[PDB]
């Protein structure tokens, strides 16, 4: 049970990380997807990670 | 898993094709019938090109 | 037969790659070619067949007529050479 | 004795490594674990084991299946089965009749716990679901472990002579066995066959 | 199952970023079905930029685990 | 009559006349067959129906 | 003697093309597979509809 | 159908109404927000019914086989 | 026309996955509303002005999610199984 | 409707639905080309309508069918000359882009050359 | 005499949900007092017809692509 | 009554249309149905790939390593994912897999599940999420006609084959690895029976 729960948590974390990174890249990249600032993308990803961490306990529940 | 991947591919293709075809919201016509197929083909070709470039060596 | 957007313009690519002072460059500029009409001129031109074929092949590679001419000329050279040697 | 077997699964199940690389010499006498279903046909080859007359028993083992029918609702086209001959063991001459047609060699392998695995494998095409919703797709899988062996050849001095017409066989002729059983994987069948090995019972 | 999940995630990311590049390059059109050379070049440039950004992100994350965990 | 019987009236069998008439009807049909249900008698709106052009040859 | 007239005609055609500035590939040119454009074999017939007529 | 389908329907409707209500102003929750959410839910349900009706009607009126009035 | 497809654990996991996707969507929506994703902002810092908007978003979601889900379930009034 | 009316309507719809049921049956060993698009179909129809509009006065005024047949035959030869090219290019066309290019060439060739030829021959007649 | 599976029913419901979401987003059908206006209803009808046509075309295209890759 | 053919055709056309309707109904249901084959029927001859052709043909076997190395995704070896976020999930007594996308995961789970393939009749499924079809026979009839189409109602085997083909196409056009391609070589021939008066070729 513990191993399955850990695997599910890891899958959720990886999916959330990838989705937030994609959202930041889509919102940041410009000029027909040819220019982007890596540091700004990282900052956006960190900010969205913080927001999702704060939102997860409120929304993700078993009821 | 593979079925899920294919379903996601198809759903994304449909969404991106419709958002372009139905931009004006006017009723579809027999020409729009083939315009949707054209957008789907372009989407598939773009995916092929992008994946090939990503998997290009070095 | 090839639509304008499907044409790769290999001849134009070769022309661009060619040097600055070239006979093809002069022809493009507008130099006109006239076949020799005297016996001496024809005899001199007789030895330029190989160069003309080579440059035409380089220009219009994959052209049906040029490729057929190259194949036929190579086969004829081989056949005549072997017959002469025999 | 080291007991370090290699599991032939995935793309290997369809293209065995030894067949793929023509390295039967290097792969010979190696423990290989396979999964699949046997065929009903059996082949007997005269042989003496422990000084007792008997017959080595060989059976087809379908290691992969491919489906090439896009008109599923119109015709039930047969699939392309990639299989290898596996030696089920040795039986005495007097007990040859005891060999049951389509006998249950090994109990079927337990179904996987993961639910996502209940799908046609991309390479082998098998589905380990105990009750597949599609009747045509239903298939039972069993797990076996054996040793890959090299096919024998004619040897008069060794008293190894085969009369195909009279049904007398003294050396394993993988080519003839594959031809008679009408197995698609003729090249691999001629390449090599597996000899099932089980722990001391 | 971990290898299968990793492969699935990789393919999903490939599809998602291919769709993103197509949308950003505007290769989706209804007039014809053939992507022109300019559009293909735009797609390749977008793929290259995505690859470079991911490489930089992975390198910096490996060098320093700045994530709050 | 569009194809007079005088072409082969000497024959009482009329086999050549039948062949000629069917050939002419089929030449007309190759032109007017696919529009029969759109702008001719086979239209759903029977009120504004037009006789099939090859009716007489048929 | 066999090839002189043919070579002269080919050269005259080439020179005329250069003078006209037609540097595009001529007719009856067949590129290799790499340069040959793939053919789209996916065709979706339009949905059938009863004619209003 | 499974109740997870209804749960997904509810999730979609809630996301749509949240976007409609807070996407423009993004202010603090108040009592009137409850009535706004109720109105949005009713409107979304009506729109879902209308679009479902039109979708089914069109895909049913699309010809499938030779007409048999018997 | 509900039917028995999944088991209890599978249904719970499906609900959890749906809630996770809803959380991602709400995260994106609130980020867009608070405008915390601009091309003129640098560093992994959150100003109090944006933190107030984030807190308002969190409070609104927490207050409204359960009520809206209950209302939608009541409106749908899906029939029982068996 | 009455029984007879229902039967007639059923007959009409069934006669119109031949394509609906013939679509399902397709042949494997077939040389399949990309159909011309609906927009290009409409453009070519409009070009033919323009040609008919140009031709209508002379043909209506003419009282002998022989002259009308001669004009029709000449214009048909001229149009078929380009129709052959259009069919050859469309069949070899490897994409809807090529099909549209061929159709555009065909319709422009009509609108210019066929219009000029029709005006010339009508003036001659 | 036709039979339908739960998976097909769920797929149809998913198509309906996708059409509803897209049409609501495009037509701003939520801007009312719980009653759809005539213009909103007309826009929703047009969007639903377009979605039906598009989903049929997309299903046919995916099926044909799969068949082509098959044979 | 003037029996001129053009005006006589007025009476003749309705009867001819009725006869054509009867004939076409017979032709569709029995003649064409039995004689014709749909969906480009053909005979397939398979061939095994021989060791002569298998020489240095499959240089890649672990597609997972290539996917990990070349895919545009963040490195999966990071240990942060173990406890990066916290969720309220419990009662996970069996292994569970995560499906991406917020709109296709439910469809994928339904496809995976076996109970979702139980056949149901219209009189049992005549209830849409919000609209009831039992009191809207016209809408119920439209729903029946919509589900009649085979594209929207296809068997699990057909769906599985379509998904397999799509996955094969994606893998081949992305990684350019031949292990995903078919090992068998197929030669396809149209063995059409021309000795039939119902269906003709072109």
């Amino acid at each position: 049970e513990d191993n399955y729960a850990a695997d599910v948590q890891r899958q959720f974390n990886r999916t959330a990380f990838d989705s937030l990174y994609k959202i930041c890249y889509n919102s940041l990249v410009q000029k027909n997807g040819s220019t982007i600032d890596f540091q700004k993308q990282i900052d956006c990803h960190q900010r969205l990670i913080q927001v999702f961490a704060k939102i997860a306990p409120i929304v993700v529940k078993v009821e | 898993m593979e079925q899920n991947t294919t379903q996601v591919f198809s759903d994304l293709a449909y969404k991106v094709c419709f958002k372009v075809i139905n931009d004006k919201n006017k009723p579809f016509v027999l020409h729009d019938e083939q315009r949707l197929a054209n957008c789907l083909t372009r989407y598939v070709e773009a995916f092929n090109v992008t994946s090939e470039y990503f998997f290009r060596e070095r | 037969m090839i639509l304008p957007h499907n044409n790769r313009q290999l001849a134009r690519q070769y022309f661009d790659s060619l040097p600055e002072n070239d006979i093809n460059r002069k022809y493009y500029e507008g130099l006109k070619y006239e076949t020799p009409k005297t016996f001496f001129g024809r005899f001199l031109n007789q030895f330029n067949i190989d160069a003309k074929l080579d440059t035409l092949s380089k220009f219009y590679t994959y052209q049906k007529t040029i490729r057929a001419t190259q194949a036929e000329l190579q086969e004829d050279r081989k056949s005549y050479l072997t017959n002469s040697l025999l | 004795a080291k007991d370090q077997p290699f599991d032939v699964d995935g793309f290997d199940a369809k293209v065995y490594p030894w067949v793929r690389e023509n390295n039967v010499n290097d792969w010979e006498y190696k423990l290989v674990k396979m999964r699949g279903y046997f065929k009903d046909q059996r082949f007997f080859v005269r042989r003496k084991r422990d000084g007792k007359e008997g017959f080595l028993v060989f059976a087809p083992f379908v290691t992969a299946v491919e489906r090439v029918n896009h008109r599923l609702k119109q015709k039930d086209l047969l699939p392309v089965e990639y299989s290898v001959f596996v030696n089920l063991g040795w039986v005495p001459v007097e007990n040859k009749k005891d060999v049951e047609l389509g006998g249950e060699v090994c109990p079927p392998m337990d179904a996987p716990t993961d639910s996502t695995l209940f799908v046609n494998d991309t390479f082998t095409g098998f589905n380990p679901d105990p009750a597949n919703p599609e009747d045509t797709e239903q298939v039972t899988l069993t797990e076996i472990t054996g040793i890959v062996r090299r096919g024998e050849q004619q040897d008069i001095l060794a008293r190894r002579r085969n009369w195909n017409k009279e049904g007398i066989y003294n050396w394993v002729d993988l080519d003839y066995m594959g031809k008679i059983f009408r197995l698609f994987n003729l090249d691999a069948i001629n390449t090599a066959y597996i000899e099932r090995v089980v722990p001391s019972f | 199952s971990d290898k299968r999940k990793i492969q699935h995630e990789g393919i999903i990311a490939l599809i998602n970023y291919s769709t993103l590049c197509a949308q950003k390059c505007d290769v989706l059109k209804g007039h014809d079905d053939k992507i022109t050379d300019t559009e293909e070049q735009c797609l390749r440039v977008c793929a290259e930029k995505i690859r470079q950004t991911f490489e930089f992100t992975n390198d910096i994350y490996l060098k320093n685990p700045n994530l709050t965990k | 009559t569009v194809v007079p019987t005088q072409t082969f009236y000497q024959m009482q069998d009329y086999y050549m006349l039948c062949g000629l008439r069917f050939e002419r009807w089929f030449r007309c049909d190759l032109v007017y067959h696919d529009q029969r249900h759109t702008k001719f008698d086979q239209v759903k709106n029977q009120k504004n129906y037009k006789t099939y052009p090859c009716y007489r040859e048929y | 003697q066999k090839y002189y007239t043919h070579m002269e005609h080919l050269w005259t055609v080439h020179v005329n093309r250069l003078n006209q500035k037609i540097l595009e590939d001529p007719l009856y040119t067949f590129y290799p597979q790499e340069l040959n454009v793939p053919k789209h074999n996916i065709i979706v017939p339009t949905i059938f509809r009863d004619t209003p007529q | 159908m499974d109740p997870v389908l209804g749960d997904v329907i509810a999730t979609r409707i809630y996301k749509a109404c949240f976007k409609h209500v807070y996407g423009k102003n993004m202010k603090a929750y108040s009592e009137k927000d409850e009535a706004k959410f109720d109105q949005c839910l009713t409107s979304y349900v009506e729109s879902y019914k209308s679009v479902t009706n039109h979708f089914i009607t069109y895909l049913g009126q699309l010809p499938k086989k030779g007409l048999s009035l018997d | 026309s509900t039917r028995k497809i999944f088991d209890s654990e599978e249904q719970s996991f499906i609900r959890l996955v749906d809630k996770f996707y809803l959380g991602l969507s709400l995260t994106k929506l609130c980020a867009q509303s608070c405008n915390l994703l601009r091309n003129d902002i640098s560093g992994s810092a959150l100003t109090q002005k944006e933190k107030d908007c984030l807190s308002i978003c969190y409070n609104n979601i927490e207050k409204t999610q359960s009520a809206f889900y209950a209302k939608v379930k009541t409106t749908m009034n899906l029939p029982a199984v068996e | 409707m009455d029984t007879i009316q229902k039967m007639n309507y059923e007959a009409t719809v069934n006669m119109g639905r031949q394509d609906l049921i013939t679509r399902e049956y397709t042949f494997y060993s077939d040389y399949e080309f990309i159909p011309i698009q609906e927009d290009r179909k409409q453009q070519m129809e409009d070009a033919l309508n323009n040609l008919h509009k140009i031709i209508h006065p002379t043909v209506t005024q003419l009282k002998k069918k022989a002259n009308v047949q001669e004009i029709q035959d000449r214009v048909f030869r001229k149009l078929q000359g380009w129709e052959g090219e259009l069919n050859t290019c469309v069949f070899s066309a490897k994409n809807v882009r090529d099909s549209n290019f061929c159709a555009d060439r065909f319709t422009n060739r009509i609108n210019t050359e066929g219009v000029e030829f029709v005006k010339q021959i009508l003036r001659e007649y | 005499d036709t039979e339908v599976s739960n998976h097909n029913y769920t797929q149809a419901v998913a198509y309906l949900n996708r059409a509803t979401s897209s049409c609501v987003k495009k037509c701003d059908s939520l801007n009312n007092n719980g009653s759809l206006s005539s213009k909103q209803e007309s826009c929703l009808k047009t969007c639903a017809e377009n979605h039906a046509i598009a989903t049929k075309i997309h299903a046919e295209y995916i099926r044909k692509l799969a068949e082509s890759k098959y044979l | 009554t003037f029996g001129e053919l053009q005006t006589a055709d007025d009476y003749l056309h309705v009867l001819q249309l009725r006869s054509q309707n009867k004939w076409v109904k017979n032709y569709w249901n029995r003649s064409l149905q039995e004689t014709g084959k749909t969906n480009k029927a053909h005979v397939i001859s398979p061939q095994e790939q021989l060791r002569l052709s298998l020489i240095n043909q499959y240089k890649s076997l672990n597609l997972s390593s290539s996917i990990k190395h070349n895919a545009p995704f963040i490195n999966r070896d990071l240990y942060v994912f173990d406890d990066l976020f916290s969720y309220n999930l419990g009662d996970i007594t069996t292994k569970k897999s995560l499906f991406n996308d917020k709109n296709s995961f439910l469809t994928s789970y339904s496809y995976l599940n076996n109970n979702s393939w139980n056949n149901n009749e219209f009189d049992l499924i005549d209830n849409l999420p919000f609209t009831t079809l039992f009191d809207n026979n016209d809408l119920f009839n439209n729903y029946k006609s919509f589900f009649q189409d085979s594209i929207f109602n296809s068997p699990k085997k057909q769906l599985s084959s379509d998904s397999k083909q799509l996955f094969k196409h994606i893998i081949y056009r992305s990684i350019k690895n031949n292990i995903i391609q078919d090992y068998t070589k197929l030669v396809k021939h149209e063995d059409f029976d021309e000795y039939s008066r119902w269906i003709k070729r072109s």
Side-chain angles (χ1 to χ4, degrees), chain K residues 33-61:
Chain K
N33 300 327
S35 62
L36 301 178
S37 181
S38 301
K39 187 67 174 61
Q40 297 179 356
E41 180 62 11
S42 301
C43 298
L44 287 175
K45 171 262 180 62
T46 301
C47 176
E49 273 60 333
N50 296 20
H51 268 93
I53 298 170
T55 185
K56 180 166 179 59
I57 295 166
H58 174 261
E60 295 293 349
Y61 184 92

Side-chain angles (χ1 to χ4, degrees), chain B residues 14-49:
Chain B
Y14 176 89
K15 178 177 288 183
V16 301
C17 252
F18 195 89
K19 287 193 298 185
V20 176
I21 295 296
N22 199 33
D23 185 74
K24 292 187 176 184
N25 194 21
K26 298 181 180 178
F28 287 173
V29 69
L30 200 63
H31 181 36
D32 300 328
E33 201 104 329
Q34 296 177 338
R35 293 178 67 262
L36 190 65
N38 301 333
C39 72
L40 291 168
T41 301
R42 294 175 74 88
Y43 169 89
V44 176
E45 181 61 17
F47 167 82
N48 298 13
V49 168

Side-chain angles (χ1 to χ4, degrees), chain C residues 1-2 7-12 24 27-28 30-31 33 35 45 52 55-56 60 62-64 69 72-73 76, chain G residues 2-4 6-8 10-12 14-15 17-19 21 23-32 35 37:
Chain C
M1 311 188 307
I2 300 164
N7 195 329
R8 311 305 181 184
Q9 299 182 355
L10 302 177
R12 176 169 294 179
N24 305 123
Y27 292 144
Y28 185 88
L31 204 173
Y33 174 87
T35 63
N45 199 331
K52 292 182 179 183
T55 182
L56 289 178
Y60 310 102
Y62 310 140
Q63 177 61 11
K64 183 180 178 182
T69 302
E72 192 201 27
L73 212 177
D76 291 334
Chain G
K2 180 176 180 179
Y3 280 94
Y4 176 79
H6 191 66
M7 212 75 254
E8 289 296 346
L10 295 176
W11 191 250
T12 300
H14 179 41
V15 171
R17 290 177 56 83
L18 292 177
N19 298 130
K21 304 183 179 179
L23 297 176
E24 301 182 0
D25 298 329
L27 298 178
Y28 299 88
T29 302
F30 307 89
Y31 310 105
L35 298 178
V37 65

Side-chain angles (χ1 to χ4, degrees), chain J:
Chain J
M1 310 179 181
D2 296 333
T3 303
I4 290 73
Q5 302 295 356
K6 287 182 175 180
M7 289 177 176
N8 297 332
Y9 181 83
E10 188 181 18
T12 55
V13 298
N14 290 340
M15 286 303 305
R17 287 181 179 183
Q18 297 177 9
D19 176 70
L20 177 61
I21 293 166
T22 61
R23 281 160 61 91
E24 190 178 17
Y25 293 89
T26 65
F27 303 105
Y28 173 78
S29 78
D30 186 321
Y31 288 86
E32 189 176 10
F33 59 85
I34 298 173
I36 299 172
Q37 309 302 296
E38 275 58 4
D39 184 67
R40 304 302 183 275
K41 286 167 161 52
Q42 186 62 27
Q43 291 175 10
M44 282 177 287
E45 290 174 356
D46 298 335
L48 183 60
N49 299 328
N50 183 26
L51 287 175
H52 288 163
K53 180 179 179 181
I54 294 172
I55 296 168
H56 176 87
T58 294
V59 298
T60 49
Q61 294 291 357
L62 288 171
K63 298 184 293 184
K64 289 195 291 294
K65 186 178 67 177
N67 303 119
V68 183
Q69 287 184 349
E70 292 177 9
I71 295 171
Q72 186 184 16
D73 190 2
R74 296 174 65 181
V75 175
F76 170 76
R77 295 155 51 192
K78 250 292 181 180
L79 294 173
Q80 190 179 16
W82 309 323
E83 181 200 331
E85 183 181 20
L86 174 58
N87 292 328
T88 303
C89 304
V90 169
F91 199 94
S92 299
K94 283 194 171 185
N95 52 33
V96 311
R97 181 186 178 184
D98 289 3
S99 180
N100 295 333
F101 177 87
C102 305
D104 298 335
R105 179 174 59 185
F106 178 76
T107 185
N108 298 332
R109 195 176 302 275
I110 279 176
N111 293 328
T112 299
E113 303 182 8
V115 170
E116 290 177 355
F117 188 85
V118 167
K119 291 184 177 180
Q120 183 179 359
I121 62 98
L122 292 175
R123 284 174 288 186
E124 288 179 353
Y125 271 83

